[PDB]
Amino acid sequence: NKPLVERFETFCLDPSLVTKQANLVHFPPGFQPIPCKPLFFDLALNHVAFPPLEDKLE
Amino acid sequence: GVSVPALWSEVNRYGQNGDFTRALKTVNKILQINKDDVTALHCKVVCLIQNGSFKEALNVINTHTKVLANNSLSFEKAYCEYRLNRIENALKTIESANQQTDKLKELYGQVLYRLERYDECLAVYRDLVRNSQDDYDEERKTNLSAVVAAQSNWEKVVPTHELCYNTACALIGQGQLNQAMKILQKAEDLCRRSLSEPQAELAIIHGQMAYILQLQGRTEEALQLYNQIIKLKPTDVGLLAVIANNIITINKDQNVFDSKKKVKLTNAEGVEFKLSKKQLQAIEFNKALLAMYTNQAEQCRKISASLQSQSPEHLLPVLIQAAQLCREKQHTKAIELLQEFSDQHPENAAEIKLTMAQLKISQGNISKACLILRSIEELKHKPGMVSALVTMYSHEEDIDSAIEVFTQAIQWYQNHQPKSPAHLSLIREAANFKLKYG
C-alpha cells in the first residue's frame, strides 16, 4: 500500500514494482498537514509605560 | 485655568489607576496648554499605543519628530510599526536607536522571531531570560520554548499549559507522536484545571490532538475532533486556517463540501500575519491539489504557478503541475518539466528523480527507469532501492547488471557500515541470487 519512498529500509521483491502500478512515489503527491503554530506572547506591550514624571510632578 | 503640576499629578494618578482614555484626554489638555514639552508627547504616544490606535501614535511620532530629536522615541515607534505588521522597518528602527534598552531587546527578540531568523532570535531571547528579571519570566520561558519548537519543526534541528503545548509542538517537529499526545493530554488537564479555577483557549490544544491523530493514521477520530474544534467557533484566525487545511489533508478527494467550506476559511483576514512562511506555503500547496481534484483546471494551474513564484523557498511544488499534465494525457511534457528542475538544483535532484522513474513504469521504458534509479547516488545502496532495481532488472532478464549492483552495494555498505543488519541481508541474498542462476 505504502509507496517505496516509505519502505527504503526494507528489502522485499515486490512484483508490482515491474508492473503499471509501480507506486514508487505519491503521484499525485500527498497533502501537506501543518502542525499548529506554537504559542507566543507579546511581552513588549508590558514595556509601554509612561516615562518618569517625578521630575515634572507636583 | 488650572495648575500644570496639578495636571501632571492627576495624569500620573490616571496612569497608575490604569485608565488610559481619560489620561489621554487630559494629556491632550496639557499639550494644548504647552505644546513644546517632550514628556507630554511621550505620554500621549504611550496612551495611544495602549488604546490600540497604533496608526495615530505613529502619526504623532512622525509629525513631531522635528520637535522631539534629543533621545528619540525609538522603542515606541518600533512597537507601533511592529503591531502594524511593519517588521522590516522595525529592524532598522531597533538597530538605529541611540542606545540599547531592555524594552528594545524584548522587541528585537519578538521581531527576530517574526522573521524566522531563529538563531539570532534564540540567542537574544537567551540573553533576555538570563540577564533580566521581572514578573513575566514564565512568558519569557514559553517564548524561548516556542522559538525552539518552531526551529525544530521547520528548520529541523534537534532540541504551565503553554509550556506543555510548546513542548508538544517541538516533539511533533521531532516526529515523536505518542509522547506528544501524552504531554498534550497533560496540557489538556492543566487547561481544564485553570479554567475551572473560556472555551476558546481549549480549542488550540485540541488542534494538536487531531493533527497527531491524522499523523498516526487515526483519520476517523481526527475528523470528529476537527469538527468539534470548528463547532466551538474559536476566535483565533490562524488556527482556524490551520484546522481548515488539516481538514483538507484528511478529506483529500472525498467530501468536497468540507473542502470548499474550509478553503472559505483558509484565506481570511489577518491569516498571512499569524502563520509562518512554511505554513502558508503548505496551505498554498494544498489549495492546488484540491483545485485539481474537484475544481476546474483553470484555477488549479494558477495556484500552483503562484506557489511556483515562491517555490525557490522550499517544499518543491513542481509535482502538482506534473501530475496535472499527467491528468491531461501529457506525460512527455511532465518528464521534461521534472528533468529540467532536476538539472537546475543539484542538492534537491536525488529525491525528485524518484518521481521520474515511476512515470516511465506506467506502460513501458522500464530500462530507462532503472537507469534513473541507479543514477540517484548516495541512495543506490539502500535495500528497498536495490530490491526494486533487481526485480525490474529481472523483468527483462538483465542479470549480470543486477549482480553488479549487488556487489557495488555490498562494497558500499562494507566500507561504510560493516556487519550491518541490512548489509548482511544484502550479502546473504546476493549469495542466494548467485546460487540460483550460477
Swiss-Prot record, chain A:
Component of the signal recognition particle (SRP) complex, a ribonucleoprotein complex that mediates the cotranslational targeting of secretory and membrane proteins to the endoplasmic reticulum (ER). The SRP complex interacts with the signal sequence in nascent secretory and membrane proteins and directs them to the membrane of the ER. The SRP complex targets the ribosome-nascent chain complex to the SRP receptor (SR), which is anchored in the ER, where SR compaction and GTPase rearrangement drive cotranslational protein translocation into the ER. This is Signal recognition particle subunit SRP68. Changing V48A: Loss of interaction with SRP72. It is found in: Cytoplasm; Nucleus, Nucleolus; Endoplasmic reticulum. Belongs to the SRP68 family. The chain holds residues 551 to 608 of 627 of the full protein. The lineage of its organism: Eukaryota, Metazoa, Chordata, Craniata, Vertebrata. Changing D42A: Loss of interaction with SRP72. Residues 38-58 are annotated as: Required for interaction with SRP72. The N-terminus is required for RNA-binding. It comes from Homo sapiens. It is linked to Neutropenia, severe congenital, 10, autosomal recessive: A form of severe congenital neutropenia, a disorder of hematopoiesis characterized by maturation arrest of granulopoiesis at the level of promyelocytes with peripheral blood absolute neutrophil counts below 0.5 x 10(9)/l, and early onset of severe bacterial infections. SCN10 is characterized by infantile onset of neutropenia. Anemia and thrombocytopenia may be transiently present. Heterodimer with SRP72. SRP68/SRP72 heterodimer formation is stabilized by the presence of 7SL RNA. Component of a signal recognition particle (SRP) complex that consists of a 7SL RNA molecule of 300 nucleotides and six protein subunits: SRP72, SRP68, SRP54, SRP19, SRP14 and SRP9. Within the SRP complex, interacts (via C-terminus) with SRP72 (via N-terminus). Changing F50A: Loss of interaction with SRP72.
From Swiss-Prot, chain B:
Residues 2-156 are annotated as: Required for interaction with SRP68. GO terms for cellular component: cytosol; endoplasmic reticulum; signal recognition particle; signal recognition particle, endoplasmic reticulum targeting. There is a cross-link at K368 (Glycyl lysine isopeptide (Lys-Gly) (interchain with G-Cter in SUMO2)). Residues 356-438 are annotated as: Required for the interaction with the SRP68/7SL RNA complex. Keywords: Acetylation, Cytoplasm, Disease variant, Endoplasmic reticulum, Isopeptide bond, Phosphoprotein, Repeat, Ribonucleoprotein, Signal recognition particle, TPR repeat, Ubl conjugation. It is found in: Cytoplasm; Endoplasmic reticulum. There is a cross-link at K368 (Glycyl lysine isopeptide (Lys-Gly) (interchain with G-Cter in SUMO1)). GO terms for molecular function: 7S RNA binding; RNA binding; signal recognition particle binding; TPR domain binding. GO terms for biological process: SRP-dependent cotranslational protein targeting to membrane. It comes from the Eukaryota. TPR repeats lie at residues 4-37, 102-135, 203-236, 383-416. Component of the signal recognition particle (SRP) complex, a ribonucleoprotein complex that mediates the cotranslational targeting of secretory and membrane proteins to the endoplasmic reticulum (ER). The SRP complex interacts with the signal sequence in nascent secretory and membrane proteins and directs them to the membrane of the ER. The SRP complex targets the ribosome-nascent chain complex to the SRP receptor (SR), which is anchored in the ER, where SR compaction and GTPase rearrangement drive cotranslational protein translocation into the ER. It is linked to Bone marrow failure syndrome 1: An autosomal dominant disease characterized by aplastic anemia and myelodysplasia resulting from bone marrow failure. Aplastic anemia is a form of anemia in which the bone marrow fails to produce adequate numbers of peripheral blood elements. Myelodysplasia is a clonal hematopoietic stem cell disorder in which immature cells in the bone marrow become malformed and dysfunctional. Heterodimer with SRP68. SRP68-SRP72 heterodimer formation is stabilized by the presence of 7SL RNA. Component of a signal recognition particle (SRP) complex that consists of a 7SL RNA molecule of 300 nucleotides and six protein subunits: SRP72, SRP68, SRP54, SRP19, SRP14 and SRP9. Within the SRP complex, interacts (via N-terminus) with SRP68 (via C-terminus). Belongs to the SRP72 family. This is Signal recognition particle subunit SRP72. It comes from Homo sapiens. The lineage of its organism: Eukaryota, Metazoa, Chordata, Craniata, Vertebrata.
